[PDB]
Structure 1
């Protein structure tokens, strides 16, 4: 007939199906720790080495499974360390609960040790942000935070004065509303609007279907629409793998973490079907500047007409809408536009294969990723950090609907590779998990390699050591007038870092070393984490947003220099293929 409030809080977490949660203890959160300790057989605390990793891992949990991620930080600095993961959750719109320690209510507002008003710290990041002041309502406040975080797809933060969880409350009054949870209703496509949309799409001279992760349930429909109608596909970077990369009319993504065929085609398209997509570069890059008709399908009214003016907007679930389109169309014959794009994709893929297929000499990112592909299981999960790896993984990983990949899509916090892989292995112990990270990003969260060791999480860590912030060096090349600054730095030997945390590891710097090292890693990771430190060149990846290949656009000198720098002697501009099939370049 009494229960400690902290025990009730843990029971609320259990009712909501939380399996694991992350943080670092402190006096200010030791009463939650005490309750966790008693519940260790039913809910699983993961002690991280820096609280940002806990927050990042919580966000990654939710990205992966759709289940609210849970993290905590002790008062003051524990909680402020969560921020990069909390902002990742906000911007990637995934549910996360963050608990923040606080001084007991008898010492709050006394200016005592590490005691401050913590509520304003979290006001900007959080959907729901409260300091608890009563023990008997604390289960409700946690319940409320969870329910809001789910409903609103974002972060709920509760600051908990440490006395409250040690107070007895009536056993029979508290409850969880987990039993009542439901996911949002999937609205239906208006029949006449879909018919009009379909007519406009079919009348297009140079159509494209351009989807994001809002279409993640619709890969079959996307590929069949493409095949039936002879309409190429392109996607946001995060939507890579929804349709298998091998599909010959998959163009890739646009902008910079991009593939050449997608940029080139988008510039020529007259009609775009923009589906489940909130591409953030739309306006700033003038992506749709010459698009004649723009057709949008999205579940969120806040998105309709956001990125360009729509000619037809459908507020509906992507898969229901795409299914409705598919059900009212029949097979169309080939067109010049279709064949031009198919030929362009083959040329591009041959380029990427030529980089991958080198067998000896100085190691580049491209062969490292080929070596990843060669040991990758069909349902592998990839946690990808932030930098050139997004660009290179987007081009080289061979994904299918069976895979998952995650990064910090929009906040783009470096350091997520390690935490996302921790989360992935916890959620999918029987699936192969990679952490693909640059040296700058791996550096930021390197201590939590120890967490993979501690919890025996068999992640395959691959660090891309260029001794640079390469992504930023290339930006300075593009914009800055004075010499590079802050973008070239000393080596860190991550094989030695791994040794220090008691993780098996390898360092390689030559292409010919890859096959055996990756086989060894593949086998180690049947039981324990492993790290490969790939010492790679400073070669810049081909900039798909700065092509110098079309005689009509670029000087001979510039073309020659581009081909030489990027080993791109066999790449053709899309206009070559347009011209073969009798179309103008526009």
Structure 2
């Protein structure tokens, strides 16, 4: 007895627990489609409107759940449309399987219609990249691709000649290795290295703990170390929410998608504990130029001493190590450094609240995000696009350990807001999901609003319409000699786009319109997707990387101009608080 090789392939996906997958059919992938069609009760095919959205959504599946995302594209242009999502998966180091259609083996290398050597297309993006040439081994090739994508935390691509999945293979021969999958049991953290790290951290005058998403399991330990030891916390932007934003000694993130207290404290710190962190600005921004001792905890040998010369680098799990530090320390009294940082945070949060709390007038991004906070459930998931929204969401969203947020962290491809929200709702139908996107990024993937409608995925889409590539406009202001170019453009009314895909929607341009529109959207999203198009000003958000508040550092004229432009008259530089507490 026999099975179609394509049926076996789908049974390999099922064995690995793949719930849903994305793509667009074509003749060159119609034999995989045929196998999917017979298996609708167990694996859910999501037909997207552009293959990039399928690839992005597959990456987001893995970001959210840790479970391999799966997408496909038809030969030639279907597969090449996957690229921005495949590169997102590579750079955000999440497991994705991509299946690429190909001409049957009898026509390959004949220069026939939309027939090319597809293997070189995927060689750079992929950890594993093969053209299948045999039906009987095709289940194994798919199984190998999955196992490698997991092991290597990246993209596996298989090009499949369309004849192979329609061939019969022996039913009893193929298997999946999902049953062997497991996670490692690790030794405890290296005892003598962690005692020595702890002493250096505690001997510091101006310590900081600076964590990334490698510390995602360690929020409790981070907050209790901070509180016990009187050591402020700062994070990478993606690590926002691992410790609740409300924690009074959470400084935020550094650089540009950043918060003032974090930049200022980092410049003064004498010892940094760098935990589960691969901050890509470390060298180029000279972040640690002032730092006396640099301590690291990371799971990956490839990261040890990577971002700065490191005094002690412990190769270990973040949680296990932070718990072992906590077990060997006890209460320290409040210090001037602690108090200064607490005061600086309070001043900064008062500034952000002042922006949020306006009640009437021309709409700014700040109030839109307040309105999101007001309708957000405590375990909401945020799919965030790329641009000023990362900066503004990082400052204004009030996250806790119960939330999740995702974006394209390092490749930073625009357009991910829509697909990330699709993936979030497919994985978590009972959780509230937002897509927060700028107009530029929403434009790029707008057609897949129709996918939210088609699959009845009740996403709350919020488009920030400034008629600009605002993040880039600000860059041009900073660097370019000549006039702005390519950064200001003509309006798109996304409420009308939504109507065109048969999604309920609203457009607002005044602060006073927000509460009722957001309450209506909250309610619609109990059953159907909704879109709010928020027409916002072109005001530049405060640049945390170019602060002009300290009269020892900047001219009075520069400070007065900065305070005026950024509504920052009541912000004080960290040096004010350092002086206040005697530093």
Q: Distance in 2 between matches of 1:448 and 1:532?
A: 16
Q: Deviation of residue 560 (structure 1)?
A: 0.6
Q: Distance in 2 between matches of 1:83 and 1:350?
A: 42
Which ranges of structure 2 fall in alignment gaps of 5 or more residues?
Answer: none
Q: Does the Cα contact within 8 Å between 1:187 and 1:317 map onto a contact in 2? A: no
Q: Does the Cα contact within 8 Å between 1:503 and 1:529 map onto a contact in 2? A: yes
Q: Does the Cα contact within 8 Å between 1:75 and 1:101 map onto a contact in 2? A: yes
Q: Deviation of residue 188 (structure 1)?
A: 2.6
SS at match of 1:534: strand
SS at match of 2:200: helix
SS at match of 2:546: coil
Q: Distance in 2 between matches of 1:368 and 1:239?
A: 23
Partner of 1:420: 420
Q: Does the Cα contact within 8 Å between 1:22 and 1:45 map onto a contact in 2? A: yes
Q: Deviation of residue 187 (structure 1)?
A: 4.6
Q: Distance in 2 between matches of 1:183 and 1:153?
A: 13
SS at match of 1:156: strand
Q: Deviation of residue 40 (structure 1)?
A: 0.6
Q: Deviation of residue 186 (structure 1)?
A: 3.6
Could you give the per-residue CA deviations for residues 457-494 of structure 1, whole angstroms, max 9, x where no partner exists?
A: 00000000000000000000000010000000000000
Q: Distance in 1 between matches of 2:577 and 2:67?
A: 46
SS at match of 2:544: coil
Q: Does the Cα contact within 8 Å between 1:187 and 1:315 map onto a contact in 2? A: no
1:455 is the counterpart of 2:455: yes
SS at match of 1:182: coil
Q: Distance in 1 between matches of 2:201 and 2:137?
A: 55
| RMSD of aligned residue pairs (Cα, Å) | 0.6
Q: Deviation of residue 185 (structure 1)?
A: 4.2
TM-score (normalizing by structure 2): 1.00
Could you give the per-residue CA deviations for residues 532-584 of structure 1, whole angstroms, max 9, x where no partner exists?
A: 000000000000000000011111111111111100000000000000011xx
Q: Distance in 2 between matches of 1:247 and 1:17?
A: 37
Q: Deviation of residue 182 (structure 1)?
A: 1.3
Q: Distance in 2 between matches of 1:573 and 1:498?
A: 44
SS at match of 2:98: strand
Partner of 2:355: 355
Q: Deviation of residue 123 (structure 1)?
A: 0.2
Q: Deviation of residue 77 (structure 1)?
A: 0.2
Q: Deviation of residue 99 (structure 1)?
A: 0.1
Q: Deviation of residue 231 (structure 1)?
A: 0.1
Partner of 2:119: 119
SS at match of 2:287: coil
Q: Distance in 1 between matches of 2:38 and 2:279?
A: 46
Could you give the per-residue CA deviations for residues 221-276 of structure 1, whole angstroms, max 9, x where no partner exists?
A: 00000000000000000000000000000000000000000000000000000000
Q: Distance in 2 between matches of 1:238 and 1:146?
A: 26
Q: Distance in 2 between matches of 1:187 and 1:550?
A: 48
Q: Deviation of residue 189 (structure 1)?
A: 1.1
Q: Distance in 1 between matches of 2:380 and 2:67?
A: 20
Q: Which runs of 4+ in 1 moved over 2 A?
A: 183-188
Could you give the per-residue CA deviations for residues 347-400 of structure 1, whole angstroms, max 9, x where no partner exists?
A: 000000000000000000000000000000000000000000000000000000
Distance 1:487 1:29, change over 3 A: same
Q: Does the Cα contact within 8 Å between 1:139 and 1:175 map onto a contact in 2? A: yes
Which ranges of structure 1 fall in alignment gaps of 5 or more residues?
Answer: none
Q: Distance in 1 between matches of 2:538 and 2:342?
A: 32
Could you give the per-residue CA deviations for residues 312-344 of structure 1, whole angstroms, max 9, x where no partner exists?
A: 110000000000000000000010000000000
Q: Does the Cα contact within 8 Å between 1:151 and 1:183 map onto a contact in 2? A: no
TM-score (normalizing by structure 1): 0.99
Q: Distance in 2 between matches of 1:540 and 1:184?
A: 47
Q: Deviation of residue 183 (structure 1)?
A: 2.4
